[PDB]
Amino acid sequence: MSRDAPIKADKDYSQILKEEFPKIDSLAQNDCNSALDQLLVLEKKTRQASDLASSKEVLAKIVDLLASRNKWDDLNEQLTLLSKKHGQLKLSIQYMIQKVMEYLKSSKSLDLNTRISVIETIRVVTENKIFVEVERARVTKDLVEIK
Amino acid sequence: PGRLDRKIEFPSLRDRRERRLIFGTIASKMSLAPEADLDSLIIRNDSLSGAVIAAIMQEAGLRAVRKNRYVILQSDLEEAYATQVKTDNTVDKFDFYK
Amino acid sequence: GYDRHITIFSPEGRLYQVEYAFKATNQTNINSLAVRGKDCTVVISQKKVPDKLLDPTTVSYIFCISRTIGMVVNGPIPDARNAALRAKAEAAEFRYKYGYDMPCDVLAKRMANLSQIYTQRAYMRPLGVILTFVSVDEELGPSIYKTDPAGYYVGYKATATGPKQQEITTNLENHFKKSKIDHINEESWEKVVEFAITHMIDALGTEFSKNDLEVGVATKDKFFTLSAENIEERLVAIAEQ
Amino acid sequence: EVIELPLKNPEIFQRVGIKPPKGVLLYGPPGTGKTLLAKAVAATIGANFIFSPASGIVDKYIGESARIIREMFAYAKEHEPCIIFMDEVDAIGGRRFSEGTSADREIQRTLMELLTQMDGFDNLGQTKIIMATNRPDTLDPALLRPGRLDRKVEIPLPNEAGRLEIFKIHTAKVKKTGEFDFEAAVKMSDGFNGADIRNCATEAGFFAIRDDRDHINPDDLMKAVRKVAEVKKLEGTIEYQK
Amino acid sequence: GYDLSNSVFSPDGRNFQVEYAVKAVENGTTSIGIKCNDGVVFAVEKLITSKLLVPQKNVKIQVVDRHIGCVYSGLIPDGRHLVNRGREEAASFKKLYKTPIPIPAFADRLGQYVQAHTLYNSVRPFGVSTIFGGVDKNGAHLYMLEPSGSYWGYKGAATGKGRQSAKAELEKLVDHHPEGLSAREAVKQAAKIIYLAHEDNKEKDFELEISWCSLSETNGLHKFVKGDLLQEAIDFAQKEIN
Amino acid sequence: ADVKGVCTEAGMYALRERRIHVTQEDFELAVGKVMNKNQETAISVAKLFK
Amino acid sequence: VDEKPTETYSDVGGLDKQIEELVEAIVLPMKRADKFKDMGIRAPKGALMYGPPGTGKTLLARACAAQTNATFLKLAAPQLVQMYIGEGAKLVRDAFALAKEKAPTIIFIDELDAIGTKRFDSEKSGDREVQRTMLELLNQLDGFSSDDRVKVLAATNRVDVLDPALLRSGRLDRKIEFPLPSEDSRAQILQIHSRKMTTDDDINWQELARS
Amino acid sequence: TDRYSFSLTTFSPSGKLGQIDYALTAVKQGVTSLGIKATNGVVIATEKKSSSPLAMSETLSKVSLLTPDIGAVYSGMGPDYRVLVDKSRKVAHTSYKRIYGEYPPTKLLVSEVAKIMQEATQSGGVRPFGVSLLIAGHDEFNGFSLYQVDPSGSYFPWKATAIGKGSVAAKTFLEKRWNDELELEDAIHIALLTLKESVEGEFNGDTIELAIIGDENPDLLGYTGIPTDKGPRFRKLTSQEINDRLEAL
Amino acid sequence: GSRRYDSRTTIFSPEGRLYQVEYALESISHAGTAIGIMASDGIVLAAERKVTSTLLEQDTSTEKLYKLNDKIAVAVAGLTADAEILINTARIHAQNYLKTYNEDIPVEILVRRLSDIKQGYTQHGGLRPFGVSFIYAGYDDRYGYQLYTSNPSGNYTGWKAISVGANTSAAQTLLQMDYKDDMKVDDAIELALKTLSKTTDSSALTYDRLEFATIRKGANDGEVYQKIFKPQEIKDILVKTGIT
Ligand SMILES: Nc1ncnc2c1ncn2[C@@H]1O[C@H](COP(=O)(O)OP(=O)(O)OP(=O)(O)O)[C@@H](O)[C@H]1O
Ligand SMILES: Nc1ncnc2c1ncn2[C@@H]1O[C@H](COP(=O)(O)OP(=O)(O)O)[C@@H](O)[C@H]1O
Ligand SMILES: [Mg+2]
Ligand SMILES: [Mg+2]
């Protein structure tokens, strides 16, 4: 955001960890926690831009697990925790959410998924004020049809 | 006197009972929260003139259009109450005149 | 006529000369946030230096008036120095004639009384500085007393000063509403610094650096300040919270 | 919401059986566009419009000011829908006198004649007043009362991204090579009035025109938002509002 | 009103009399202060108003103690009164605590004195800025004291008409050496930015004066730069500006 | 005029009571009403003065 | 209209910057209006000129007006202060209507210290003839008459007296100080005065300028 | 130089001393306070207010002790009371506790503080203190007494009085509620009930400051085994105690 | 600076007349009526308070009547605040005379001393003078009972019957018709009350708003007893003289 140092440096690191993208994947197949530990580091940066690149990796990791209801709770939770603290500006983390929210929709192929997914989505958006709120209502709305 | 032996001074201090009577007259014109307790508002108002209360119904029914109703509720009344009665700041000044 | 040009009463009963003093302490645009810990009192304040050719180390607003009692100043630095000099002199004097160092309460009251006298005199201008006095006394615990240019002071659970201080009030109010006590329940003074920095970022929206901060901590029976190196440890420790 | 909504549709206001909302008071800093907005509202609705300054009606001939607003009023009652723009009402403002001279007492009569037309035995119909005041502290509690005036519109400075919204209207008009420094520009022109953002664009085009091109390059603008910002704050209003 | 005296005050935070007094300093002689590693190197532009004058026989540099240079601009009598006062303060410190006064301690006392005259209407505020520093036991330091009663540490300072030129090159001097520079080299750089600040005074002619207090050369004593060293500085500055 | 003011004031009270004849009670109310105007400006120099 | 043909800037000696500023403010928009129009930016609403009397300002607007081919209007604010409210208000309104009519026009207003300061709103503040004429000036320079052909030049003695609301951008745009002549400038102003009479090698204008 | 010796307080052509009239305006901008004299004590009460919710009102006193048997309470300016309370204690010691070895009579103390007022309206450089004080006390020669100190430099004894912004209404309250015989207990209940109408905020015992000059407390005496001395007749009530009297309304 | 805010408060007018003294006489006309009548056996001082209220304790008040010394008391008409200074100066001065000559101060000496202070304040310092008028009742051996009025300029004038404060003209005119030199203290008590009933400062004159004091040589052995009557002893005399 500020200074001219974060734009370049942070981006530079995300490139370096994107060359180390196969490494994160291989470990994720052996145990979830090992690769998860990498996502934590990525989503602590100071430039908004370098987190765009990195919020692909957060979505991809849980896709490689395929997907686990227990693991689902944590990913959406970690995001909520990062939003209150900073998120690299509170406006920044809302576009991150928007990317991961498309995945929630298309994951859907159980009742089981649908139920867990509405519990995470309602909470996120109570402190947000954008298009996130339309999407929350819509996924909530799948459970309405079932109701 | 003899010019003007009758002299009526009009207060704004009023009475609790006086405020109930302004509300009723208004209520005939447009019912304000007719499914909820009116009487809270009466207690809460404590300086208001008849004018502020006329401004209340009219501003509430502005908010009626927004909310897209043809009826005024107590929520409309409470925001009508909140503002139009908090003008000036002298809070700071009176810290050192306490 | 002269009911606004000297300290005489007006038909309003309000001294306009005195009002003008409070309308000059927020024009330096320095915010402060002061919180009472469970064993300490921490005060952090702005130290915005926009120049290459001003030495930032000597730009300061935290002056040690006793070895145990710090003082943080919001408002013009000539008046700050005069009020600091006077306060130091009195604190020393109290040791000399009463056999123990001046309490925070009474040091606040003494500057408060001098401020009234300066607005009693019609040729003397009051010192236009808001003084926050932080300490840990042994008879009052962690304490904050904040005096103002008129000569009014009171104790505080926490307090803020500056133009944007209303935002700071919101954070503090929530904190003590939830805890249901008049202080922070944190038993490490370092973490009360970390908390203070967090609420400063929340209130003002501004991301701080070690050269925008200046930190004073009164622990029990000593007052110290953090250097910019030590303040950087705290800023790294926000990332570890 | 105050003005336009009961003029076009009084049908909703009669149906509910609420009184039509009437009176707005505008106050803000210099330069914020109360005039610009006065000029704007008049178009939107299409209602008949009398822009009259209030320092403009004053004459040493007593009851001449009272005469002027009374006729203005009679015209407005005929020409419905109509909004009467009383601009800079602060000129004939203030209250008291009767130890003043008869010029003041006339200003007090005019101020009072205002008072007659609105409420009394005359009323507003689909007439409507907007009063503009540049200082609310010259302005008097008799006209800040509910009665007169349902919504008291306090207009701030243009917000941080409000100022960025104004630059867009203006930089639209210009021919340029492409300017991408507009985000940067609004950080330097912070604490600005909208009158001075308009000045930001006029200065940038000065430098463009002097160099003999018709394009505003971004470098011309960077310099420009700094050149206005230094001198603005030096001679700044330092207005205080209620 | 609020500008008749200095204990009138205004809601604008201004005090008027004091701000007015800075205008004398801003039309004063160019004077600089360079914070060096080993000390400080002062230099002052001394205008030559006539050929009748005796060169290097009129000084604006008076020593305080044996180790504090002090050079000032604005009203010369008023500044000579302020320096006269601070020669007493240095003597008092030396009497009571048996040490030459430390540079931060010296600044504190002077600030109090200048504060006193802005708090009373029965005495007149000062209108001079002094630049003073030296070498003490806590290291070399540099301070400039405003007639308001404000001082700070400085890595470079300037005052007078040609302060614009001086300060701009002092930024570049700290960008030449971000790890600081020798006192000996700073002689030649003090010369250079007086010469560049004489382009604000190029309707006039000048005499270059340089004085230093540095540990490396003068052993923590304040002395004047003279003879061949002074002439070397002149020759250096001459080639750079050519 | 003040004297005259009593006569008229007195007939407000008698009228209401629905008794024509003026009485001591009609009088006591009537002098209290006319004196009210005067007592209030006389309590501010009779009390809270120096 | 009291236009006299151009005085000419050559003949208004010294003060190079003042001459530079007027060209930039007036002539450049009037001649190069087409470029200002295509861009859609506004041509200066006013330029404030302030500083002590006799700094040449009159001479300059009168030169500029002939060159730019706008009429020279003569308006002086200390006159417009009267005891009669009606009479005093009337000539402001007359001068505004007539200017727009005779437009493009350079209105040259002298000594706007008679519009005074308003900083207060108390009972007495001028009785509402001094406050009132400040607000009548604000409607001159308000964009309810097109001030892109009219160009308002005004002279005033100090602005420090005057309330700073009137002084902001679009009131008045450029804020231009006129200092005293310097040593070298004095010599130029002396020479042109002397140029008018017999001129001889005895006289040295520089010599006279230094004394 | 100094040449301020020309009195700031001076006569106006319509009579009255203009400066003290101005100062009295400031008393009717301040907080409301009242005092009822019972035949078995005196009660004085005032309202605590705060400009911040993070201000503590237990560090804020507006009823203060001058001597153990004489308390004071103000309405007016905060700063002006702050300085003048210290001077009241000081002159009580110099003029009767170093001369007659005891605390001054309530009559004596009131007179002396009115002189301090008087000389702050005499000579230049000093404008009055913009407070009115109720000085309730007890002496052993005239029993209970309630005084009201004016910013004029005069005093008046009262049977019950009020000062502050809501004084006029409050004194009409006390007029029917006062009687020839009263109890201290019922005096308190009147005082709180009256100050209910002069408080616009909270009405807790934490925000209502109450103090009695009732009767002696030998637990505040600080020593025992001297039966001759009587403890402090003054006793400031803690917040919990004030809450009990709120339930006793 | 200092001279900026001064207006030269105490100076002559073109008539010769001191602004602050002229102003001072207006403010004494605000303050209540005080009457003094010199009988051939005493001096009666009778004053109607400028404040009365049902909540005002007036039963311990002695706000107009103050004893300067054992044979000299004053009644006050003017600012109570201003008067307080002169009252304690008088006590000091009378005691000082007693200390040095072991003889009681004559009435002339005490009045003259106070008068000098009032003159002095307009003469130098820029000080406002005391805006009070006192009526001194005093006994001395040499001139017997002596009655004196002092004005805020600082000048004293003897009388036999006189009134200061409110309704000075009305009180004086009634006194001229009724006063006789054969009057006793008994007769003077009745006259004072009647005069105050016709110069009343509201619409009623009452005991509780009356302060009353005499100095009578009817105490045994030619001694003088100053008695300041309580309002219920005033009440007794109020029914005696038939005011009530
Ligand atoms: N909302 C806006 N978008 C575009 N330009 C604007 C806007 N608001 C104001 N401006 C610009 O600023 C100028 C100044 O506004 P305007 O003349 O309405 O001032 P004002 O607030 O009425 O002051 P006064 O107190 O002198 O009456 C406008 O002419 C316009 O160029
Ligand atoms: N720069 C100049 N060169 C020559 N004479 C000048 C110059 N400036 C002013 N003067 C003389 O002084 C007179 C007054 O100046 P004028 O233009 O009328 O000024 P202003 O508007 O500043 O009051 C001119 O008529 C001219 O005689
Ligand atoms: Mg406008
Ligand atoms: Mg001219």
Side-chain angles (χ1 to χ4, degrees), chain D residues 29-36 88 134 166 170 194-195 198, chain G residues 168 171:
Chain D
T32 207
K34 320 193 201 71
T35 324
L36 196 57
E88 310 212 71
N134 181 27
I166 304 167
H170 310 150
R198 187 62 181 193
Chain G
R168 81 154 195 265
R171 285 287 170 243

Side-chain angles (χ1 to χ4, degrees), chain I residues 60-81:
Chain I
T60 53
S61 295
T62 47
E63 61 178 65
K64 302 305 190 179
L65 275 288
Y66 284 103
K67 296 177 179 180
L68 305 182
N69 52 276
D70 66 299
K71 304 193 182 66
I72 305 174
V74 284
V76 171
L79 271 287
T80 307

Side-chain angles (χ1 to χ4, degrees), chain C residues 78-120:
Chain C
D79 296 295
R81 293 176 173 127
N82 201 99
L85 192 94
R86 185 57 181 148
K88 288 165 192 178
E90 289 294 297
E93 193 71 285
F94 212 83
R95 183 59 180 85
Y96 183 62
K97 296 191 177 299
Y98 301 106
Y100 67 106
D101 192 61
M102 201 163 194
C104 197
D105 183 60
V106 188
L107 182 66
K109 191 179 182 183
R110 184 61 63 241
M111 295 306 299
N113 291 344
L114 292 160
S115 293
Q116 190 279 340
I117 296 166
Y118 299 165
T119 59
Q120 181 175 44

Side-chain angles (χ1 to χ4, degrees), chain G residues 11-13 52-59 108 189 192-193:
Chain G
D11 307 303
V12 168
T55 44
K57 298 173 184 182
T58 313
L59 298 184
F108 184 43
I189 296 159
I192 181 71
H193 299 297

Side-chain angles (χ1 to χ4, degrees), chain A:
Chain A
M1 286 175 281
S2 301
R3 321 301 183 228
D4 61 272
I7 294 165
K8 296 298 188 294
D10 291 21
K11 202 79 190 172
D12 189 37
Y13 292 146
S14 290
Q15 186 71 27
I16 278 178
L17 304 165
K18 262 184 291 170
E19 283 307 295
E20 279 164 16
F21 206 62
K23 189 186 52 83
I24 318 181
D25 299 325
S26 294
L27 296 177
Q29 296 309 101
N30 285 95
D31 185 15
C32 66
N33 301 285
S34 287
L36 182 55
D37 285 303
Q38 315 298 292
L39 299 180
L40 306 181
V41 164
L42 279 158
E43 300 270 295
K44 301 267 205 312
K45 286 283 180 291
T46 303
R47 177 66 285 181
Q48 307 167 351
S50 41
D51 305 293
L52 303 170
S54 301
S55 47
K56 299 159 169 63
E57 303 180 1
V58 178
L59 190 163
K61 196 251 174 291
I62 185 158
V63 173
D64 293 0
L65 305 182
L66 190 66
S68 322
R69 301 291 85 236
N70 321 284
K71 190 59 179 56
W72 193 265
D73 302 308
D74 300 292
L75 196 124
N76 292 96
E77 287 184 311
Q78 207 60 230
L79 283 178
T80 299
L81 295 154
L82 187 54
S83 59
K84 282 190 164 138
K85 199 170 168 173
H86 294 288
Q88 286 93 32
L89 183 52
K90 288 72 169 164
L91 302 180
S92 190
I93 193 54
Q94 298 178 298
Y95 309 139
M96 316 299 172
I97 288 160
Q98 264 287 276
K99 298 161 163 68
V100 177
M101 277 179 162
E102 307 315 293
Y103 175 36
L104 317 172
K105 307 173 192 289
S106 63
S107 183
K108 284 170 197 67
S109 51
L110 315 184
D111 193 53
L112 294 166
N113 284 5
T114 313
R115 163 183 82 196
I116 301 294
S117 307
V118 174
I119 318 177
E120 314 315 307
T121 56
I122 65 190
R123 185 191 58 221
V124 159
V125 294
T126 312
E127 51 186 71
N128 299 333
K129 49 173 188 288
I130 63 156
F131 194 51
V132 290
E133 303 176 296
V134 183
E135 315 303 92
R136 174 262 311 257
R138 193 189 313 167
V139 286
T140 307
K141 170 156 157 295
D142 306 290
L143 190 54
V144 174
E145 294 306 314
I146 280 175
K147 284 185 182 178

Side-chain angles (χ1 to χ4, degrees), chain H residues 3-7 9-16 37 118-119 121-123 152-154 156-160 171, chain I residues 1-3 5-6 20 23 26-27 30 54-57 61 63 80-82 85 88 125-129 131:
Chain H
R3 310 174 184 82
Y4 289 79
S5 295
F6 56 99
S7 304
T9 306
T10 40
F11 305 103
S12 300
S14 301
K16 306 169 289 181
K37 182 165 58 178
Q118 236 298 300
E119 295 299 298
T121 58
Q122 190 68 67
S123 306
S152 303
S154 189
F156 290 123
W158 299 78
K159 303 176 185 179
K171 288 191 295 297
Chain I
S2 305
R3 307 193 289 104
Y5 305 110
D6 188 49
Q20 296 295 303
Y23 300 167
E26 190 58 64
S27 62
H30 300 174
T54 189
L55 294 172
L56 187 66
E57 185 171 60
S61 295
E63 61 178 65
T80 307
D82 291 359
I85 305 300
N88 293 6
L127 306 171
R128 50 167 177 84

